[PDB]
C-alpha cells in the first residue's frame, strides 16, 4: 500500500522550528523554514496529463524587522538593559546576555526572524472561503496571514503588537488590584514582563456559530490569550476580543483545543501539556458565544511530572462501538512514547482511561499526526523510522496496535524532520534529509518534502462513492489517487464506473454527477488530450452532456429561489427570462418541477424586458449559451457560473481549477444572492475565490 508519489519537493532553506510540517483542511502543506514558510498547494489538475502531484508553490516571507517585546518605556528599558549587561554578578549578567528573548538582535548574534511554528485555521476563516495561516517567528512575532490573490501572502494582523500594547496599557497586570506596578529594574519583574508575552505555540478552535473562530496563544509563563475573530477575518477590525486565562502550568510546552458533543450538548476546553510532563485540560471559563458551553472543572490526564516533554497533542472524535456513544481520543507525544487518553461522557460524567503505548522508537518523537477520520496515529523520529499506530476498540476504552513503515524501502537511508497526513488519510508527507550512509555522515544536507500513498486506489474509489461529506474539494487527496490511476491506465476501472452508475441511478444527487464529470475529464486527459479521435469526440460529448446536466440543476435552483423571495421586478441581477427561455428551450428533459416553476415565474415576470447590456456598446446580450455572451459588435463577456450575469467587471473570481467563474457580490445585490454567490463552484466544488 505504501509507495512513493513521484515529485519530491526541494526546499531552498533549512527547516526550522517546532513540528515543522502541517497539512491543512484546504490541502495546502506548509513547512516552516529559516527564511519563509513554503506552502505546497495540491491541485487535482484537470487540464494536464502529467501523473505527478500538481503542487503549486507559494511562500510567506520571513519578516525584515526583528521584534522587540515591549516591557516598558523606550528609555526605561534601555537603562535597565545597560544595568543588567554591566552587572558584576555572573548569574544576572550571563542570564541577560545569553537569553535571546531579551536580545532579539545584536552585534554578533544571528537574527531569529525565521519561523518557530505555524498553524492552519479551519476553512471559511479567510475573506475568501479559504483558511487562514497563523505564523510565529522565533523572535515571537505572531502574525495571521492570508492569500487573497493566488500569488502573494499578506499579513492581516500582528497579534504580538496588539497584545504588547494592551499589556502596557494595563501596566502588565491582569487583575489591577492583584499586584503592584513592580519595578522594571528588578530582573525577576523584567524577566516576567518578557515571559508573560513570549508565545510558545498556538491553535485555532473550530468555527463557533455569524461565524467566529477562537485562537489560543500559549505563553512561557502559562498565561493563555484566547483571541476571538469575527468571520470572514479581514484584519484588526475582526478581532472581537482578547482574554487571558492563567493556566498556572509551569513551563507549558504544547496546547490543543478540545471540542466535543454529547446528547447534542456542546462542550469544550483547552488541553495543555507541560514540558515537565503532565497533561491537563483547562475549562475555558471565559467566552462570549452563547451556543457553546465549557467544561466545569479541570481534569488531569497525566500527573506524573516525569519531565518527558509533551512535544505534540492531537485528538480525534470517535464513536465507540461497545459503549455505543461518542467519545474523544487524545494522543500526546511524550519523549519517545505516545500517551493516549480516551474521554467519554456518560451518566457518571467523564469516564477516563489512559496509557502509554510503548516501544515505538529509540529516540524522542519529533512529530505526530492524527487521521481525523479513523484516529490512526503516525509518529516519527530523526532516525527515519515512521510508525503507523492503529486504535483498536476494546470492550472498555482502546488498545493500540502499531507497525513500522519502511521508509528505507522507498527512499533509502534517510532522516525525517517531520510528517503530515492528508485530510482523508490519502497521503503522508515527510520532510526527508540525507541519512547516515553505512555509518558515515552525509557530506551535504538538503531538506525535501516527499509523499507516500497511504491508501490503495480501490479504497480511495470506494470511500469517494460512500463519502459522507459529499464534496470533492474536501477529498482532493482521494480523487488524486483516482486521478493517478486513470492517467496511468488510460481507462476508468470498470467497477468504479458500474458502482457510480448504480449510485447515480439510485440516488442521483449532484455530488455523483460531479464525480462522473471528474472521471470523464481525467479520462479525456489520459488519452493524449481515426478511432482515438472518435473516442475523444465520444467522451467529450459525454462531458458536455453531464456538464449540461449540472448547469440545469443549478439554474433550476436559482430560479427555484427567485420564486421564493420578493419578485425582483427590475430584473436587477439575474437574467431571469433568459434562464426561463434556456430551460424551456428543449423538451428533451421532462422535469415538470422546472417546467411549472418557469410557468409560475413567467406568469409573474414583468412584460417589461429589462435586458442586459454590453458595457462597450449599451446593446443587448441575447443569452444564447451557458459560458459566454456576445453582441453585434463582437465583444465576448464570460457569464458568472453562479448567477449567469455577465462578468463585465475588470476583476472577477475564478475557480481554483479555473474550470469555473464567478462574479463579485455588490451592495446592490440582495442578501439571498450575496449568500448564493458564496456557493462553491457547481462543477468542481473548489473555491471560486
Amino acid at each position: 500500500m505504501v509507495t512513493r508519489r513521484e515529485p519530491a519537493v526541494k526546499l531552498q532553506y533549512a527547516v526550522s522550528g517546532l513540528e515543522p510540517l502541517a497539512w491543512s483542511e484546504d490541502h495546502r502543506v506548509s513547512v516552516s523554514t529559516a527564511r519563509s514558510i513554503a506552502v505546497l498547494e495540491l491541485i487535482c489538475d484537470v487540464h494536464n496529463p502529467g501523473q505527478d502531484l500538481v503542487i503549486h508553490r507559494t511562500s510567506v516571507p520571513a519578516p525584515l524587522n526583528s521584534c522587540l517585546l515591549k516591557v516598558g518605556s523606550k528609555t526605561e528599558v534601555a537603562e535597565c538593559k545597560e544595568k543588567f549587561a554591566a552587572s558584576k554578578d555572573p548569574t544576572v549578567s550571563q542570564t541577560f546576555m545569553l537569553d535571546r528573548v531579551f536580545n532579539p538582535e545584536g552585534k554578533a548574534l544571528p537574527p531569529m526572524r525565521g519561523f518557530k511554528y505555524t498553524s492552519w485555521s479551519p476553512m471559511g476563516c479567510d475573506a475568501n472561503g479559504r483558511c487562514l495561516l497563523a505564523a510565529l517567528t522565533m523572535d515571537n512575532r505572531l502574525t495571521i496571514q492570508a492569500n487573497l490573490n493566488r500569488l502573494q501572502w499578506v499579513q492581516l494582523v500582528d497579534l504580538t503588537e496588539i497584545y504588547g500594547e494592551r499589556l502596557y496599557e494595563t501596566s502588565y497586570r491582569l487583575s489591577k488590584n492583584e499586584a503592584p506596578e513592580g519595578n522594571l529594574g528588578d530582573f525577576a519583574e523584567f524577566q516576567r514582563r518578557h515571559s508573560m508575552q513570549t508565545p510558545v505555540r498556538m491553535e485555532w478552535s473550530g468555527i463557533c456559530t455569524v461565524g467566529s473562530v477562537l485562537l489560543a496563544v500559549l505563553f512561557e509563563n502559562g498565561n493563555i490569550a484566547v483571541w476571538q475573530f469575527q468571520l470572514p477575518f479581514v484584519g484588526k477590525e475582526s478581532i472581537s476580543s482578547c482574554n487571558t486565562i492563567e493556566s498556572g502550568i509551569t513551563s507549558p510546552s504544547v496546547l490543543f483545543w478540545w471540542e466535543y458533543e454529547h446528547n447534542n450538548r456542546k462542550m469544550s476546553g483547552l488541553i495543555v501539556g507541560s514540558a515537565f510532563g503532565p497533561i491537563k485540560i483547562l475549562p475555558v471559563n471565559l467566552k462570549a458565544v452563547k451556543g457553546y458551553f465549557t467544561l466545569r472543572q479541570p481534569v488531569i490526564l497525566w500527573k506524573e511530572m516525569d519531565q518527558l516533554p509533551v512535544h505534540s497533542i492531537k485528538c480525534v472524535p470517535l464513536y465507540h462501538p461497545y459503549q455505543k456513544c461518542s467519545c474523544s481520543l487524545v494522543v500526546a507525544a511524550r519523549g519517545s512514547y505516545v500517551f493516549w487518553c480516551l474521554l467519554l461522557i456518560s451518566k457518571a460524567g467523564l469516564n477516563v482511561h489512559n496509557s502509554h503505548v510503548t516501544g515505538l522508537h529509540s529516540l524522542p518523537i519529533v512529530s505526530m499526526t492524527a487521521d481525523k477520520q479513523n484516529g490512526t496515529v503516525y509518529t516519527c523520529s530523526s532516525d527515519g523510522k515512521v510508525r503507523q499506530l492503529i486504535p483498536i476498540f476494546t470492550d472498555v476504552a482502546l488498545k493500540f496496535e502499531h507497525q513500522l513503515i519502511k521508509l528505507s524501502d522507498v527512499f533509502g537511508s534517510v532522516r525525517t524532520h517531520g510528517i503530515a497526513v492528508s485530510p482523508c488519510g490519502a497521503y503522508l508527507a515527510i520532510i526527508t534529509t540525507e541519512g547516515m550512509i553505512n555509518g558515515l555522515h552525509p557530506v551535504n544536507k538538503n531538506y525535501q518534502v516527499q509523499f507516500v500513498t497511504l491508501k490503495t486506489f480501490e479504497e480511495a474509489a470506494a470511500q469517494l462513492l460512500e463519502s459522507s461529506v459529499q464534496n470533492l474539494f474536501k477529498q482532493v487527496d482521494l480523487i488524486d489517487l483516482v486521478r493517478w490511476k486513470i492517467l496511468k491506465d488510460k481507462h476508468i476501472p470498470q467497477f468504479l464506473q458500474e458502482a457510480l452508475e448504480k449510485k447515480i441511478e439510485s440516488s442521483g444527487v449532484t455530488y455523483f454527477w460531479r464525480f462522473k464529470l471528474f472521471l470523464l475529464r481525467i479520462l479525456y486527459q489520459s488519452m493524449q488530450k481515426e478511432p482515438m479521435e472518435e473516442k475523444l469526440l465520444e467522451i467529450q460529448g459525454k462531458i458536455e452532456a453531464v456538464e449540461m446536466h449540472l448547469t440545469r440543476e443549478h439554474m433550476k435552483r436559482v430560479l427555484g429561489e427567485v420564486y421564493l423571495h420578493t419578485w425582483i421586478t427590475e430584473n436587477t441581477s439575474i437574467p431571469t427570462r433568459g434562464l426561463c427561455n434556456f430551460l424551456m428551450s428543449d423538451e428533451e428533459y421532462d422535469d415538470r418541477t422546472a417546467r411549472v416553476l418557469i410557468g409560475h415565474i413567467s406568469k409573474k415576470m414583468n412584460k417589461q424586458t429589462f435586458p442586459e447590456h454590453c458595457s462597450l456598446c449599451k446593446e443587448i446580450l441575447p443569452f444564447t449559451d451557458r459560458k459566454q455572451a456576445v453582441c453585434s459588435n463582437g465583444h465576448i463577456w464570460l457569464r458568472c457560473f453562479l448567477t449567469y450575469q455577465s462578468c463585465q467587471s475588470l476583476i472577477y473570481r475564478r475557480c481554483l481549477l479555473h474550470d469555473s467563474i464567478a462574479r463579485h457580490p455588490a451592495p446592490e445585490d440582495p442578501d439571498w444572492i450575496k449568500r448564493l454567490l458564496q456557493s462553491p463552484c457547481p462543477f468542481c466544488d473548489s473555491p471560486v475565490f
Binding site: 526541494k10 531552498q12 532553506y13 527564511r35 519563509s36 513554503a38 500538481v54 503542487i55 503549486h56 508553490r57 507559494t58 511562500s59 500569488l151 502573494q152 558515515l440 555522515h441 557530506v443 551535504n444 462597450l616 456598446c617 459588435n633 463582437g634 465583444h635 465576448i636 475588470l650 476583476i651 475564478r654 479555473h658
Partner: protein, 542 residues
C-alpha cells in the same frame, strides 16, 4: 488561461524593459493560444483600464522612443523534398529591441535587463490615482507619451511568469543567470539558441554562457534540445535550443522524421532488409539526403551495412539490415586529520591520489579537502604532480618518501631535460606571420624535434597526425584537438621556437589555406617557403 490574465501575463513576459503600447497589441495578436477578444479600439480601452487599475503594473517614460518589434518567426517550416524542414530561417538581424544591460546587485532584489533603468521616470501616479482609478484613456496616454510610455509588471509578477505555478518563488538566481531566463521568457514559444545568446545577446565566451546556464538546468527551469540552423550557405548548423518550460515543444527534424519512416519501413518489412534505391524510391528521396539517413541509422546502431546478390534479394547489391577507486578512510579518534590524510597518501604510494579522490576517501567538503592538500604541500611532506586525464589537468599528490621515485616524477624529469636539450640546440599567395605537464612537454618536444629535423612542415594536420599516433602508441584514449595544437603552436611562437606562416593561395577558381610552420632560421622570403607555396599550388591545381 483567462483573457484578463493572458494580458497581464504578456506584460510580465517581457522583461524589466517592458512594453510600448503598440508592442503590447502586437504581442496579444501574435499570442498562442489565441487571444480571446477581437482587440477592437473599444476593447483596447477596456484592456488599458485593466492595466491602469492593476496595482502590480507600473508605467515609465523612457528618454527615447523604442523600436517596433519584428516578425519574430524563426523557422522555415516548409520543404520541397518529402516532409518539411523546421530549421531556423534567418530574418534580418535588425537592431535589437531589447539589448542586454543587466541590473546587477540590486538592493531591492529586482533583476533583469534594462538599458534605461536608472534614467526613466515613474509616471504611475500621472496615469492613475493612488486609489487605482485610471486618470487617462489609452488614446490620451499614447498621444501624450507615444512609444516613450513603457509598461512593466512587478518583479513578483515577472518572476512568476518565468517559473509558472509549480515553480518555487524562494529561489534566487544570479543576475546573469536570471537575465538568461528573462531572455528566454520574452521569446515565448521560439526560444533563443544558445549559440545566439553568447554570440550576440550577451556577447561572451561560450564557457560563460554555459556556466551561467548550469543553474537554470540544475533547478530545471529550462529545457534543452539540439536544433538546426539552415545557413544561406545551404549547409546547416547544429546549435542548442533553449526553451523555458512553459513554452517547451519537442521540435522534430527532417532527418528524424525521415529516419522514422525508414525505421517503420524496415521494421514492417519482415526481412528488415531493403536495397538503398528502393528505400529511396519508396520515400522519393535523393541520394544526397538519403546517405545521411543511412549513416544516421548506422551511427544510431539501429541497422547494419549488408550486401546481397540480386538473386539473394529475389550481381552484388548494397542493402541495409535493421537490427534495433581508493578505499574509504575510517576516521580514527586518536589522530589529527593532517596525520590521517598523510597516512592515506602513503598507502597509495608511487601512484599518488588526487584532491578529488582524497575528498571522497576522507568524506569532507570541497573546501576542506583543498585545505588538507594546501597544508601538506606547505609542510613539504607531500609533493604535487600535474597529470592530464580526460579534459582535466588534475593534480596527483605523492608523499616525499616516494615522490622522487614516482613515475610522474621520472617521466616529467626526462621530458624537462629532453626539453632543455631541444631548446638549447636552437641556433644563435601572400604570406602573413602570426602573432607544465608530462604530456604537454612531450607534445612540445615532438614539435620542436619535427621543426629541427624538418625545417618546414606543411600543415598543422601533419603535426596533429604524428602527435595522435604517438599518443596512440602510448595508448592515450583521448584524441588531441586542433585548437589544442594551434594554441600549443602559438605558445611556441611566443617562445620564438618556430614561425607559423599563414595565407590563402588561389588557383583555378579555388582557394586553400596553407598554414606553413618553419624553423625560426628562415623568414617568409626564403626559397623553401616559396617552394612549399608552389608545390601546394601545384597539388591544388586542377
Amino acid at each position: 488561461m483567462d483573457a484578463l490574465e493572458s494580458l497581464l501575463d504578456e506584460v510580465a513576459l517581457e522583461g524589466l524593459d517592458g512594453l510600448c503600447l503598440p508592442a503590447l497589441w502586437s504581442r496579444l495578436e501574435t499570442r498562442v493560444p489565441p487571444f480571446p477578444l477581437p482587440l477592437e479600439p473599444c476593447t483596447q480601452e477596456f484592456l488599458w483600464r485593466a492595466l491602469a487599475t492593476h496595482p502590480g503594473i507600473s508605467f515609465y517614460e523612457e528618454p527615447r522612443e523604442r523600436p517596433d518589434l519584428q516578425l519574430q518567426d524563426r523557422y522555415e517550416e516548409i520543404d520541397l523534398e518529402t516532409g518539411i524542414l523546421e530549421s531556423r530561417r534567418d530574418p534580418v538581424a535588425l537592431e535589437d529591441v531589447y539589448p542586454i544591460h543587466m541590473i546587477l546587485e540590486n538592493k531591492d532584489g529586482i533583476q533583469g535587463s534594462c538599458r534605461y533603468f536608472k534614467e526613466r521616470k515613474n509616471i504611475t501616479n500621472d496615469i492613475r490615482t493612488k486609489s487605482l482609478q485610471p486618470r487617462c484613456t489609452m488614446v490620451e496616454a499614447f498621444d501624450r507619451w507615444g512609444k516613450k510610455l513603457i509598461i512593466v509588471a512587478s518583479q513578483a509578477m515577472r518572476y512568476r511568469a518565468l517559473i509558472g505555478q509549480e515553480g518555487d518563488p524562494d529561489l534566487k538566481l544570479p543576475d546573469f543567470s536570471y537575465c538568461i531566463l528573462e531572455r528566454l521568457g520574452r521569446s515565448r514559444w521560439q526560444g533563443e539558441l544558445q549559440r545566439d545568446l553568447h554570440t550576440t545577446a550577451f556577447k561572451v565566451d561560450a564557457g560563460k554562457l554555459h556556466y551561467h546556464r548550469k543553474i537554470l538546468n540544475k533547478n530545471g527551469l529550462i529545457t534543452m534540445q539540439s536544433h538546426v540552423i539552415r545557413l544561406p550557405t545551404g549547409a546547416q548548423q547544429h546549435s542548442i535550443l533553449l526553451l523555458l518550460n512553459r513554452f517547451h515543444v519537442d521540435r522534430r527534424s527532417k532527418y528524424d522524421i525521415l529516419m522514422e519512416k525508414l525505421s517503420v519501413m524496415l521494421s514492417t518489412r519482415t526481412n528488415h532488409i531493403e536495397t538503398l534505391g528502393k528505400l529511396r524510391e519508396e520515400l522519393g528521396l535523393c541520394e544526397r539526403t538519403f546517405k545521411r539517413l543511412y549513416q544516421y541509422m548506422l551511427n544510431a546502431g539501429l541497422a547494419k551495412v549488408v550486401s546481397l546478390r540480386l538473386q539473394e534479394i529475389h550481381v552484388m547489391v548494397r542493402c541495409l539490415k535493421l537490427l534495433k577507486t581508493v578505499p574509504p578512510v575510517d576516521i580514527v579518534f586518536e589522530r589529527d586529520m593532517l596525520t590521517q590524510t598523510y597516512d592515506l597518501i602513503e598507502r597509495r604510494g608511487t601512484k599518488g591520489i588526487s584532491q578529488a579522490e582524497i575528498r571522497v576517501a576522507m568524506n569532507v567538503g570541497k573546501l576542506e579537502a583543498r585545505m588538507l592538500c594546501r597544508l601538506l604541500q606547505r609542510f613539504k611532506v607531500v609533493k604535487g604532480f600535474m597529470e592530464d586525464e580526460g579534459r582535466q589537468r588534475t593534480t596527483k599528490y605523492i608523499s616525499c618518501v616516494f615522490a622522487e621515485e614516482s613515475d610522474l616524477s621520472r617521466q616529467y624529469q626526462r621530458e624537462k631535460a629532453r626539453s632543455e636539450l631541444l631548446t638549447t640546440v636552437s641556433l644563435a599567395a601572400v604570406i602573413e606571420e602570426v602573432r607544465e605537464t608530462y604530456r604537454l612537454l612531450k607534445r612540445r618536444n615532438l614539435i620542436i624535434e619535427a621543426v629541427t629535423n624538418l625545417r618546414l612542415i606543411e600543415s598543422l594536420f601533419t603535426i596533429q597526425k604524428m602527435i595522435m599516433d604517438q599518443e596512440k602508441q602510448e595508448g592515450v584514449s583521448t584524441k588531441c584537438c586542433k585548437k589544442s595544437i594551434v594554441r600549443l603552436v602559438r605558445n611556441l611562437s611566443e617562445e620564438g621556437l618556430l614561425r607559423l606562416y599563414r595565407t590563402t593561395v588561389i588557383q583555378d577558381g579555388i582557394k586553400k589555406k596553407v598554414d606553413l610552420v618553419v624553423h625560426p632560421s628562415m623568414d617568409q622570403n626564403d626559397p623553401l617557403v616559396r617552394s612549399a607555396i608552389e608545390q601546394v599550388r601545384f597539388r591544388i591545381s586542377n
